[PDB]
Symmetry: C3
Subunit: 195 residues, 3 copies
Protein backbone atom coordinates (compact mmCIF):
# COMPACT_ATOMS: atom_id res chain seq x y z
CA UNK A 1 0.00 0.00 0.00
CA UNK A 2 1.05 3.60 -0.62
CA UNK A 3 -0.59 6.27 1.53
CA UNK A 4 -0.12 9.88 0.50
CA UNK A 5 -1.08 13.10 2.27
CA UNK A 6 -0.67 11.43 5.65
CA UNK A 7 1.05 14.16 7.64
CA UNK A 8 -1.18 16.55 9.64
CA UNK A 9 0.27 18.32 12.69
CA UNK A 10 -2.68 19.07 14.98
CA UNK A 11 -0.93 22.05 16.57
CA UNK A 12 -0.65 23.77 13.20
CA UNK A 13 -4.43 24.05 12.86
CA UNK A 14 -6.59 26.47 14.87
CA UNK A 15 -10.28 26.10 13.98
CA UNK A 16 -13.95 26.26 14.89
CA UNK A 17 -14.14 22.56 14.00
CA UNK A 18 -15.09 21.82 10.37
CA UNK A 19 -18.80 21.54 11.10
CA UNK A 20 -19.65 23.87 13.95
CA UNK A 21 -22.98 24.04 15.71
CA UNK A 22 -24.34 27.59 16.16
CA UNK A 23 -21.35 29.39 17.60
CA UNK A 24 -21.55 32.99 16.53
CA UNK A 25 -23.61 36.14 16.86
CA UNK A 26 -24.39 38.47 13.97
CA UNK A 27 -27.50 40.11 15.45
CA UNK A 28 -28.69 37.69 18.14
CA UNK A 29 -27.03 34.96 20.21
CA UNK A 30 -26.09 31.85 18.26
CA UNK A 31 -27.75 33.03 15.06
CA UNK A 32 -24.82 31.90 12.90
CA UNK A 33 -22.67 28.88 12.20
CA UNK A 34 -19.24 30.39 11.54
CA UNK A 35 -16.59 28.11 10.08
CA UNK A 36 -12.98 29.28 10.20
CA UNK A 37 -9.93 27.12 9.71
CA UNK A 38 -6.47 28.59 10.17
CA UNK A 39 -3.48 26.51 9.08
CA UNK A 40 0.02 27.70 9.86
CA UNK A 41 2.32 27.59 6.85
CA UNK A 42 5.52 29.15 8.19
CA UNK A 43 5.30 32.91 8.00
CA UNK A 44 1.79 32.80 6.57
CA UNK A 45 -1.51 31.48 7.81
CA UNK A 46 -3.68 29.81 5.14
CA UNK A 47 -7.38 30.21 5.93
CA UNK A 48 -10.80 29.12 4.77
CA UNK A 49 -13.98 30.80 6.03
CA UNK A 50 -17.71 30.28 5.62
CA UNK A 51 -20.80 31.64 7.41
CA UNK A 52 -24.39 30.42 7.61
CA UNK A 53 -27.35 32.10 9.33
CA UNK A 54 -29.55 29.70 11.30
CA UNK A 55 -32.25 31.96 12.78
CA UNK A 56 -33.94 33.98 10.00
CA UNK A 57 -33.48 36.20 6.93
CA UNK A 58 -31.23 39.20 6.37
CA UNK A 59 -33.87 41.77 7.33
CA UNK A 60 -34.10 40.04 10.70
CA UNK A 61 -30.35 40.29 11.36
CA UNK A 62 -29.47 43.72 9.96
CA UNK A 63 -30.41 47.25 11.07
CA UNK A 64 -30.25 50.09 8.54
CA UNK A 65 -26.91 48.90 7.15
CA UNK A 66 -26.62 46.37 4.34
CA UNK A 67 -23.80 44.40 5.93
CA UNK A 68 -22.95 41.50 8.22
CA UNK A 69 -19.78 41.72 10.34
CA UNK A 70 -18.07 38.95 12.30
CA UNK A 71 -15.14 40.03 14.47
CA UNK A 72 -12.49 38.11 16.36
CA UNK A 73 -10.41 39.83 19.07
CA UNK A 74 -7.30 38.25 20.61
CA UNK A 75 -5.17 39.16 23.62
CA UNK A 76 -1.38 39.41 23.67
CA UNK A 77 -1.12 35.60 23.79
CA UNK A 78 -3.50 35.11 20.87
CA UNK A 79 -6.34 33.90 23.10
CA UNK A 80 -9.86 34.74 21.91
CA UNK A 81 -11.46 37.57 23.90
CA UNK A 82 -15.07 37.81 25.04
CA UNK A 83 -15.71 40.80 22.79
CA UNK A 84 -15.76 38.56 19.74
CA UNK A 85 -18.69 37.38 17.60
CA UNK A 86 -17.44 33.82 17.94
CA UNK A 87 -17.85 31.73 21.11
CA UNK A 88 -14.67 30.31 22.63
CA UNK A 89 -15.82 26.81 23.54
CA UNK A 90 -14.95 25.12 20.25
CA UNK A 91 -12.14 27.38 19.06
CA UNK A 92 -8.87 25.46 19.52
CA UNK A 93 -6.24 23.28 17.87
CA UNK A 94 -7.33 20.10 16.17
CA UNK A 95 -8.25 16.69 17.53
CA UNK A 96 -9.76 14.63 14.65
CA UNK A 97 -12.84 16.52 13.43
CA UNK A 98 -13.10 18.32 16.74
CA UNK A 99 -11.00 20.43 19.08
CA UNK A 100 -8.46 19.22 21.61
CA UNK A 101 -9.98 19.12 25.09
CA UNK A 102 -7.27 21.40 26.51
CA UNK A 103 -7.54 25.07 25.55
CA UNK A 104 -4.48 26.69 24.02
CA UNK A 105 -2.70 29.35 26.05
CA UNK A 106 -0.58 30.83 23.26
CA UNK A 107 -1.45 31.14 19.56
CA UNK A 108 0.72 34.10 18.56
CA UNK A 109 1.93 32.02 15.60
CA UNK A 110 -1.58 32.30 14.14
CA UNK A 111 -2.03 36.05 14.69
CA UNK A 112 -1.86 38.66 11.96
CA UNK A 113 1.57 40.34 11.92
CA UNK A 114 1.46 43.74 13.61
CA UNK A 115 4.25 45.21 11.47
CA UNK A 116 2.48 44.15 8.26
CA UNK A 117 -0.95 45.09 9.61
CA UNK A 118 -0.70 47.67 12.37
CA UNK A 119 -3.32 48.67 14.91
CA UNK A 120 -4.89 51.89 13.56
CA UNK A 121 -8.22 53.70 13.17
CA UNK A 122 -7.34 54.50 9.54
CA UNK A 123 -8.49 52.17 6.73
CA UNK A 124 -4.98 51.22 5.55
CA UNK A 125 -5.36 49.26 2.32
CA UNK A 126 -2.80 46.56 3.13
CA UNK A 127 -4.65 45.63 6.31
CA UNK A 128 -7.61 44.50 4.20
CA UNK A 129 -8.32 41.71 1.73
CA UNK A 130 -11.27 42.71 -0.52
CA UNK A 131 -13.06 40.50 -2.99
CA UNK A 132 -16.40 40.18 -4.76
CA UNK A 133 -18.28 37.09 -3.58
CA UNK A 134 -21.80 35.75 -4.19
CA UNK A 135 -24.70 35.13 -1.83
CA UNK A 136 -25.61 31.45 -2.12
CA UNK A 137 -23.15 31.21 -5.03
CA UNK A 138 -25.60 33.15 -7.22
CA UNK A 139 -23.92 35.38 -9.81
CA UNK A 140 -26.88 37.74 -9.66
CA UNK A 141 -26.41 38.33 -5.92
CA UNK A 142 -22.95 39.81 -5.48
CA UNK A 143 -21.56 41.02 -2.20
CA UNK A 144 -18.18 42.48 -1.20
CA UNK A 145 -16.16 40.60 1.41
CA UNK A 146 -13.75 42.83 3.34
CA UNK A 147 -11.37 40.99 5.69
CA UNK A 148 -9.60 43.34 8.08
CA UNK A 149 -6.39 42.23 9.80
CA UNK A 150 -5.67 44.12 13.04
CA UNK A 151 -6.22 47.77 12.07
CA UNK A 152 -9.83 48.89 12.35
CA UNK A 153 -10.93 45.44 13.57
CA UNK A 154 -9.09 45.98 16.86
CA UNK A 155 -11.09 46.68 20.01
CA UNK A 156 -10.13 49.78 21.94
CA UNK A 157 -12.95 49.52 24.50
CA UNK A 158 -11.86 50.19 28.08
CA UNK A 159 -10.70 46.97 29.76
CA UNK A 160 -11.13 44.93 26.57
CA UNK A 161 -8.30 46.23 24.41
CA UNK A 162 -7.21 43.59 21.90
CA UNK A 163 -3.66 43.04 20.71
CA UNK A 164 -4.55 41.19 17.51
CA UNK A 165 -7.84 40.93 15.63
CA UNK A 166 -9.56 40.04 12.40
CA UNK A 167 -12.98 40.88 11.02
CA UNK A 168 -15.07 39.56 8.18
CA UNK A 169 -17.55 42.03 6.71
CA UNK A 170 -19.91 41.19 3.87
CA UNK A 171 -21.58 44.24 2.34
CA UNK A 172 -24.04 44.77 -0.49
CA UNK A 173 -26.27 47.36 -2.14
CA UNK A 174 -28.69 49.01 0.27
CA UNK A 175 -32.23 47.71 -0.01
CA UNK A 176 -31.31 44.36 -1.50
CA UNK A 177 -31.52 40.81 -0.18
CA UNK A 178 -33.88 41.50 2.74
CA UNK A 179 -35.71 38.18 2.37
CA UNK A 180 -32.63 36.09 1.67
CA UNK A 181 -30.97 33.76 4.16
CA UNK A 182 -27.32 34.71 4.75
CA UNK A 183 -25.13 31.88 3.49
CA UNK A 184 -21.66 32.32 2.04
CA UNK A 185 -19.47 30.16 -0.15
CA UNK A 186 -16.19 28.89 1.27
CA UNK A 187 -13.49 31.52 0.76
CA UNK A 188 -9.72 31.19 0.87
CA UNK A 189 -7.20 33.78 2.00
CA UNK A 190 -3.79 34.03 3.64
CA UNK A 191 -2.01 36.59 5.82
CA UNK A 192 1.43 37.21 7.28
CA UNK A 193 1.81 35.70 10.76
CA UNK A 194 3.18 37.53 13.80
CA UNK A 195 5.79 34.82 14.44
Amino acid sequence: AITIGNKNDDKLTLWTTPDPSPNCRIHSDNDCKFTLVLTKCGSQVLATVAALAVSGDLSSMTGTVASVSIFLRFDQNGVLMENSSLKKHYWNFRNGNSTNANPYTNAVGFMPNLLAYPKTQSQTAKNNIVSQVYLHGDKTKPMILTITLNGTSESTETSEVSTYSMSFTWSWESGKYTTETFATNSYTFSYIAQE
Copy 2:
Protein backbone atom coordinates in the same frame (compact mmCIF):
# COMPACT_ATOMS: atom_id res chain seq x y z
CA ALA B 1 26.27 28.78 -0.46
CA ILE B 2 22.84 29.28 1.10
CA THR B 3 19.95 27.36 -0.46
CA ILE B 4 16.44 28.33 0.57
CA GLY B 5 13.10 26.70 -0.21
CA ASN B 6 14.74 23.30 -0.42
CA LYS B 7 12.20 21.12 1.36
CA ASN B 8 9.53 19.42 -0.79
CA ASP B 9 7.89 16.21 0.48
CA ASP B 10 6.75 14.31 -2.62
CA LYS B 11 3.97 12.52 -0.73
CA LEU B 12 2.36 15.84 0.16
CA THR B 13 1.63 16.65 -3.48
CA LEU B 14 -1.07 14.93 -5.56
CA TRP B 15 -1.12 16.27 -9.13
CA THR B 16 -1.75 15.83 -12.83
CA THR B 17 1.92 16.72 -13.36
CA PRO B 18 2.61 20.44 -13.94
CA ASP B 19 2.43 20.18 -17.72
CA PRO B 20 -0.04 17.47 -18.63
CA SER B 21 -0.64 16.13 -22.10
CA PRO B 22 -4.34 15.87 -23.06
CA ASN B 23 -5.79 14.07 -20.08
CA CYS B 24 -9.37 15.17 -19.70
CA ARG B 25 -12.75 15.10 -21.39
CA ILE B 26 -15.10 18.08 -21.52
CA HIS B 27 -17.13 17.01 -24.57
CA SER B 28 -14.92 14.48 -26.37
CA ASP B 29 -12.05 12.21 -25.32
CA ASN B 30 -8.82 14.01 -24.53
CA ASP B 31 -10.12 17.40 -25.63
CA CYS B 32 -8.61 19.17 -22.61
CA LYS B 33 -5.34 19.59 -20.78
CA PHE B 34 -6.42 19.82 -17.13
CA THR B 35 -3.81 20.93 -14.62
CA LEU B 36 -4.54 20.37 -10.93
CA VAL B 37 -2.02 20.47 -8.13
CA LEU B 38 -3.07 19.58 -4.60
CA THR B 39 -0.62 20.29 -1.78
CA LYS B 40 -1.40 19.08 1.72
CA CYS B 41 -0.96 21.78 4.35
CA GLY B 42 -2.14 20.05 7.52
CA SER B 43 -5.90 20.29 7.78
CA GLN B 44 -6.19 22.14 4.49
CA VAL B 45 -5.30 21.31 0.93
CA LEU B 46 -3.86 24.23 -1.09
CA ALA B 47 -4.71 23.91 -4.78
CA THR B 48 -4.01 25.49 -8.14
CA VAL B 49 -6.09 24.64 -11.22
CA ALA B 50 -6.02 25.50 -14.91
CA ALA B 51 -7.77 24.12 -18.00
CA LEU B 52 -6.99 24.37 -21.72
CA ALA B 53 -9.05 23.03 -24.63
CA VAL B 54 -6.97 21.35 -27.33
CA SER B 55 -9.57 20.22 -29.91
CA GLY B 56 -11.73 23.20 -30.98
CA ASP B 57 -13.81 26.19 -29.88
CA LEU B 58 -16.52 26.47 -27.22
CA SER B 59 -19.40 25.86 -29.64
CA SER B 60 -17.77 22.53 -30.49
CA MET B 61 -17.58 21.41 -26.84
CA THR B 62 -20.85 22.71 -25.38
CA GLY B 63 -24.49 21.73 -26.02
CA THR B 64 -27.24 24.23 -25.21
CA VAL B 65 -25.64 25.19 -21.89
CA ALA B 66 -23.04 27.94 -21.57
CA SER B 67 -20.77 26.00 -19.22
CA VAL B 68 -17.83 23.62 -19.02
CA SER B 69 -17.70 21.12 -16.13
CA ILE B 70 -14.79 18.94 -15.03
CA PHE B 71 -15.54 16.43 -12.28
CA LEU B 72 -13.35 14.22 -10.13
CA ARG B 73 -14.86 11.28 -8.22
CA PHE B 74 -12.95 9.36 -5.53
CA ASP B 75 -13.65 6.11 -3.69
CA GLN B 76 -13.44 5.58 0.06
CA ASN B 77 -9.63 5.42 -0.16
CA GLY B 78 -9.38 8.62 -2.20
CA VAL B 79 -8.56 6.76 -5.42
CA LEU B 80 -9.79 8.38 -8.64
CA MET B 81 -12.83 6.61 -10.12
CA GLU B 82 -13.52 5.93 -13.78
CA ASN B 83 -16.53 8.25 -13.77
CA SER B 84 -14.25 11.27 -13.72
CA SER B 85 -13.40 13.77 -16.48
CA LEU B 86 -9.72 13.26 -15.73
CA LYS B 87 -7.76 10.16 -16.78
CA LYS B 88 -5.99 8.25 -14.01
CA HIS B 89 -2.67 7.48 -15.67
CA TYR B 90 -0.83 10.63 -14.62
CA TRP B 91 -2.71 11.47 -11.43
CA ASN B 92 -0.42 10.60 -8.50
CA PHE B 93 2.09 11.90 -5.97
CA ARG B 94 5.14 13.71 -7.23
CA ASN B 95 8.39 12.47 -8.71
CA GLY B 96 10.31 15.51 -10.09
CA ASN B 97 8.09 17.11 -12.75
CA SER B 98 6.21 13.86 -13.19
CA THR B 99 4.32 11.29 -11.16
CA ASN B 100 5.79 8.46 -9.12
CA ALA B 101 5.64 5.19 -11.05
CA ASN B 102 3.68 3.45 -8.28
CA PRO B 103 0.02 4.45 -7.98
CA TYR B 104 -1.20 5.59 -4.59
CA THR B 105 -3.65 3.36 -2.75
CA ASN B 106 -4.82 5.87 -0.14
CA ALA B 107 -5.17 9.65 -0.50
CA VAL B 108 -7.82 10.38 2.12
CA GLY B 109 -5.56 13.16 3.41
CA PHE B 110 -6.24 15.05 0.17
CA MET B 111 -10.02 14.56 0.12
CA PRO B 112 -12.55 17.27 0.95
CA ASN B 113 -13.79 16.88 4.53
CA LEU B 114 -17.21 15.23 4.62
CA LEU B 115 -18.30 17.01 7.82
CA ALA B 116 -17.40 20.41 6.34
CA TYR B 117 -18.77 19.50 2.91
CA PRO B 118 -21.35 16.74 3.13
CA LYS B 119 -22.71 14.55 0.36
CA THR B 120 -26.06 16.10 -0.63
CA GLN B 121 -28.25 16.90 -3.64
CA SER B 122 -28.88 20.39 -2.23
CA GLN B 123 -26.66 23.32 -3.30
CA THR B 124 -25.27 24.05 0.19
CA ALA B 125 -23.31 27.29 -0.03
CA LYS B 126 -20.34 26.17 2.07
CA ASN B 127 -19.69 23.24 -0.26
CA ASN B 128 -18.89 25.69 -3.05
CA ILE B 129 -16.17 28.23 -3.79
CA VAL B 130 -17.46 30.83 -6.29
CA SER B 131 -15.45 33.50 -8.02
CA GLN B 132 -15.49 35.67 -11.13
CA VAL B 133 -12.67 34.73 -13.50
CA TYR B 134 -11.76 35.77 -17.05
CA LEU B 135 -11.54 33.79 -20.28
CA HIS B 136 -7.99 34.18 -21.59
CA GLY B 137 -7.40 36.75 -18.84
CA ASP B 138 -9.58 39.24 -20.74
CA LYS B 139 -11.54 41.61 -18.50
CA THR B 140 -14.25 41.83 -21.15
CA LYS B 141 -14.85 38.06 -21.07
CA PRO B 142 -15.90 37.20 -17.54
CA MET B 143 -17.00 33.77 -16.42
CA ILE B 144 -18.06 32.37 -13.04
CA LEU B 145 -16.00 29.52 -11.61
CA THR B 146 -17.96 27.31 -9.19
CA ILE B 147 -15.88 24.68 -7.37
CA THR B 148 -18.05 22.09 -5.64
CA LEU B 149 -16.59 19.98 -2.82
CA ASN B 150 -18.44 16.68 -2.28
CA GLY B 151 -22.11 17.73 -2.25
CA THR B 152 -23.66 17.90 -5.71
CA SER B 153 -20.39 16.82 -7.36
CA GLU B 154 -20.77 13.32 -5.89
CA SER B 155 -21.76 10.45 -8.17
CA THR B 156 -24.76 8.42 -7.08
CA GLU B 157 -24.88 6.23 -10.21
CA THR B 158 -25.48 2.56 -9.49
CA SER B 159 -22.18 0.73 -8.95
CA GLU B 160 -20.14 3.94 -9.22
CA VAL B 161 -21.05 5.73 -6.02
CA SER B 162 -18.26 8.08 -4.95
CA THR B 163 -17.27 8.82 -1.38
CA TYR B 164 -15.47 12.10 -2.08
CA SER B 165 -15.59 14.38 -5.12
CA MET B 166 -14.84 17.79 -6.53
CA SER B 167 -16.07 19.59 -9.63
CA PHE B 168 -14.96 22.67 -11.49
CA THR B 169 -17.69 24.44 -13.45
CA TRP B 170 -17.08 27.55 -15.52
CA SER B 171 -20.28 29.28 -16.61
CA TRP B 172 -21.05 32.40 -18.62
CA GLU B 173 -23.86 34.32 -20.29
CA SER B 174 -25.83 32.24 -22.77
CA GLY B 175 -24.96 32.95 -26.39
CA LYS B 176 -21.50 34.31 -25.71
CA TYR B 177 -18.03 33.02 -26.51
CA THR B 178 -19.05 30.42 -29.11
CA THR B 179 -15.97 31.00 -31.27
CA GLU B 180 -13.51 31.31 -28.40
CA THR B 181 -11.04 28.62 -27.36
CA PHE B 182 -11.55 27.58 -23.73
CA ALA B 183 -8.46 28.55 -21.75
CA THR B 184 -8.45 29.56 -18.11
CA ASN B 185 -6.01 31.45 -15.94
CA SER B 186 -4.38 29.63 -13.04
CA TYR B 187 -6.65 29.81 -10.00
CA THR B 188 -5.87 29.22 -6.33
CA PHE B 189 -8.17 27.80 -3.68
CA SER B 190 -8.03 25.75 -0.50
CA TYR B 191 -10.39 23.37 1.31
CA ILE B 192 -10.62 21.49 4.58
CA ALA B 193 -9.14 17.99 4.35
CA GLN B 194 -10.84 14.81 5.54
CA GLU B 195 -7.86 13.84 7.70
Copy 3:
Protein backbone atom coordinates in the same frame (compact mmCIF):
# COMPACT_ATOMS: atom_id res chain seq x y z
CA ALA C 1 0.88 26.05 28.98
CA ILE C 2 -0.06 24.93 25.47
CA THR C 3 1.53 26.84 22.58
CA ILE C 4 0.12 26.25 19.11
CA GLY C 5 1.35 27.44 15.72
CA ASN C 6 4.93 27.43 16.95
CA LYS C 7 6.76 25.98 13.96
CA ASN C 8 8.16 28.44 11.39
CA ASP C 9 11.12 27.38 9.23
CA ASP C 10 12.93 30.58 8.26
CA LYS C 11 14.33 29.05 5.07
CA LEU C 12 10.84 28.37 3.78
CA THR C 13 10.01 32.08 3.61
CA LEU C 14 11.43 34.48 1.00
CA TRP C 15 10.15 38.03 1.54
CA THR C 16 10.58 41.78 1.33
CA THR C 17 10.15 41.85 5.12
CA PRO C 18 6.55 42.35 6.32
CA ASP C 19 6.86 46.12 6.58
CA PRO C 20 9.27 47.32 3.92
CA SER C 21 10.58 50.84 3.61
CA PRO C 22 10.42 52.25 0.05
CA ASN C 23 11.98 49.47 -1.97
CA CYS C 24 10.45 49.55 -5.41
CA ARG C 25 10.13 51.64 -8.53
CA ILE C 26 6.90 52.07 -10.47
CA HIS C 27 7.78 55.34 -12.23
CA SER C 28 10.59 56.85 -10.13
CA ASP C 29 13.16 55.44 -7.71
CA ASN C 30 11.75 54.26 -4.41
CA ASP C 31 8.25 55.52 -5.15
CA CYS C 32 6.62 52.35 -3.81
CA LYS C 33 6.56 50.12 -0.77
CA PHE C 34 6.14 46.64 -2.25
CA THR C 35 5.30 43.82 0.14
CA LEU C 36 5.71 40.26 -1.10
CA VAL C 37 5.86 37.16 1.05
CA LEU C 38 6.55 33.79 -0.53
CA THR C 39 6.09 30.68 1.62
CA LYS C 40 7.14 27.31 0.28
CA CYS C 41 4.46 24.66 0.71
CA GLY C 42 5.97 21.65 -1.05
CA SER C 43 5.29 21.86 -4.76
CA GLN C 44 3.47 25.17 -4.41
CA VAL C 45 4.46 28.59 -3.20
CA LEU C 46 1.78 30.42 -1.17
CA ALA C 47 2.06 34.18 -1.60
CA THR C 48 0.64 37.43 -0.30
CA VAL C 49 1.29 40.75 -2.07
CA ALA C 50 0.50 44.40 -1.44
CA ALA C 51 1.72 47.68 -2.95
CA LEU C 52 1.64 51.28 -1.70
CA ALA C 53 2.77 54.42 -3.53
CA VAL C 54 4.74 56.84 -1.35
CA SER C 55 5.60 59.71 -3.73
CA GLY C 56 2.40 61.05 -5.36
CA ASP C 57 -0.85 60.23 -7.18
CA LEU C 58 -1.50 57.93 -10.14
CA SER C 59 -1.19 60.69 -12.76
CA SER C 60 2.32 61.32 -11.45
CA MET C 61 3.39 57.67 -11.85
CA THR C 62 1.69 56.64 -15.09
CA GLY C 63 2.23 57.72 -18.72
CA THR C 64 -0.60 57.26 -21.23
CA VAL C 65 -1.42 53.78 -19.94
CA ALA C 66 -3.84 53.14 -17.09
CA SER C 67 -1.69 50.52 -15.38
CA VAL C 68 1.03 49.95 -12.80
CA SER C 69 3.48 47.06 -13.33
CA ILE C 70 5.96 45.59 -10.86
CA PHE C 71 8.31 42.96 -12.25
CA LEU C 72 10.73 40.54 -10.63
CA ARG C 73 13.43 38.82 -12.70
CA PHE C 74 15.53 35.92 -11.39
CA ASP C 75 18.63 34.17 -12.70
CA GLN C 76 19.11 30.41 -13.02
CA ASN C 77 19.73 30.16 -9.26
CA GLY C 78 16.63 32.16 -8.37
CA VAL C 79 18.63 35.25 -7.40
CA LEU C 80 16.94 38.61 -8.01
CA MET C 81 18.35 40.44 -11.04
CA GLU C 82 19.01 44.16 -11.35
CA ASN C 83 16.35 44.53 -14.04
CA SER C 84 13.62 44.21 -11.43
CA SER C 85 11.29 46.85 -9.94
CA LEU C 86 12.23 45.64 -6.47
CA LYS C 87 15.56 46.43 -4.79
CA LYS C 88 17.62 43.46 -3.63
CA HIS C 89 18.81 44.69 -0.24
CA TYR C 90 15.89 43.42 1.83
CA TRP C 91 14.77 40.49 -0.32
CA ASN C 92 15.86 37.31 1.47
CA PHE C 93 14.82 34.49 3.78
CA ARG C 94 13.41 35.35 7.17
CA ASN C 95 15.06 36.42 10.40
CA GLY C 96 12.30 37.56 12.83
CA ASN C 97 10.50 40.47 11.16
CA SER C 98 13.50 41.14 8.97
CA THR C 99 15.79 39.35 6.55
CA ASN C 100 18.74 37.13 7.40
CA ALA C 101 22.00 39.06 7.09
CA ASN C 102 23.44 36.55 4.61
CA PRO C 103 22.00 36.71 1.09
CA TYR C 104 20.66 33.50 -0.39
CA THR C 105 22.55 31.98 -3.31
CA ASN C 106 19.87 29.55 -4.47
CA ALA C 107 16.08 29.96 -4.31
CA VAL C 108 14.99 27.69 -7.16
CA GLY C 109 12.48 26.13 -4.75
CA PHE C 110 10.58 29.44 -4.79
CA MET C 111 10.61 29.95 -8.57
CA PRO C 112 7.61 29.46 -10.83
CA ASN C 113 7.78 26.06 -12.54
CA LEU C 114 9.00 26.39 -16.12
CA LEU C 115 7.04 23.36 -17.37
CA ALA C 116 3.81 24.73 -15.89
CA TYR C 117 4.61 28.30 -16.93
CA PRO C 118 7.03 28.39 -19.84
CA LYS C 119 9.09 31.30 -21.10
CA THR C 120 7.17 32.71 -24.09
CA GLN C 121 6.16 35.96 -25.78
CA SER C 122 2.59 34.66 -26.14
CA GLN C 123 -0.03 35.45 -23.47
CA THR C 124 -0.64 31.81 -22.44
CA ALA C 125 -3.62 31.80 -20.09
CA LYS C 126 -2.19 29.35 -17.55
CA ASN C 127 0.84 31.56 -16.99
CA ASN C 128 -1.45 34.24 -15.56
CA ILE C 129 -3.63 34.64 -12.47
CA VAL C 130 -6.32 37.30 -13.13
CA SER C 131 -8.70 38.76 -10.60
CA GLN C 132 -10.80 41.86 -10.00
CA VAL C 133 -9.48 43.86 -7.05
CA TYR C 134 -10.33 47.28 -5.58
CA LEU C 135 -8.28 50.44 -5.21
CA HIS C 136 -8.22 51.30 -1.50
CA GLY C 137 -10.75 48.51 -0.95
CA ASP C 138 -13.45 50.67 -2.55
CA LYS C 139 -16.08 48.70 -4.48
CA THR C 140 -16.58 51.67 -6.79
CA LYS C 141 -12.91 51.66 -7.85
CA PRO C 142 -12.25 48.28 -9.43
CA MET C 143 -9.00 47.30 -11.06
CA ILE C 144 -7.79 44.07 -12.69
CA LEU C 145 -4.74 42.38 -11.19
CA THR C 146 -2.83 40.22 -13.69
CA ILE C 147 0.00 38.15 -12.19
CA THR C 148 2.28 36.69 -14.85
CA LEU C 149 4.49 33.71 -14.02
CA ASN C 150 7.54 33.39 -16.31
CA GLY C 151 6.06 33.83 -19.80
CA THR C 152 5.76 37.45 -20.88
CA SER C 153 7.26 38.68 -17.58
CA GLU C 154 10.66 37.26 -18.56
CA SER C 155 13.43 39.63 -19.61
CA THR C 156 15.06 38.92 -22.94
CA GLU C 157 17.27 42.03 -22.94
CA THR C 158 20.84 41.39 -24.07
CA SER C 159 23.04 40.44 -21.11
CA GLU C 160 20.10 40.46 -18.68
CA VAL C 161 18.16 37.40 -19.75
CA SER C 162 16.14 36.00 -16.84
CA THR C 163 15.47 32.33 -16.22
CA TYR C 164 12.43 32.81 -13.97
CA SER C 165 10.22 35.85 -13.42
CA MET C 166 6.95 37.17 -12.10
CA SER C 167 5.07 40.40 -12.71
CA PHE C 168 2.18 42.12 -11.01
CA THR C 169 0.13 44.41 -13.24
CA TRP C 170 -2.85 46.40 -12.01
CA SER C 171 -4.93 47.88 -14.82
CA TRP C 172 -8.08 49.98 -14.95
CA GLU C 173 -10.30 52.00 -17.28
CA SER C 174 -8.43 54.70 -19.16
CA GLY C 175 -8.96 58.18 -17.77
CA LYS C 176 -9.91 57.07 -14.28
CA TYR C 177 -8.19 57.44 -10.92
CA THR C 178 -5.68 60.13 -11.92
CA THR C 179 -5.85 61.90 -8.55
CA GLU C 180 -5.91 58.74 -6.45
CA THR C 181 -2.97 57.40 -4.47
CA PHE C 182 -2.06 53.85 -5.55
CA ALA C 183 -2.69 51.50 -2.63
CA THR C 184 -3.76 47.89 -2.94
CA ASN C 185 -5.38 45.44 -0.58
CA SER C 186 -3.43 42.35 0.45
CA TYR C 187 -3.93 39.62 -2.15
CA THR C 188 -3.32 35.89 -1.90
CA PHE C 189 -2.23 33.54 -4.66
CA SER C 190 -0.24 30.36 -5.17
CA TYR C 191 1.81 28.85 -8.01
CA ILE C 192 3.58 25.63 -8.87
CA ALA C 193 7.24 25.67 -7.81
CA GLN C 194 10.17 24.68 -10.02
CA GLU C 195 11.45 22.16 -7.46
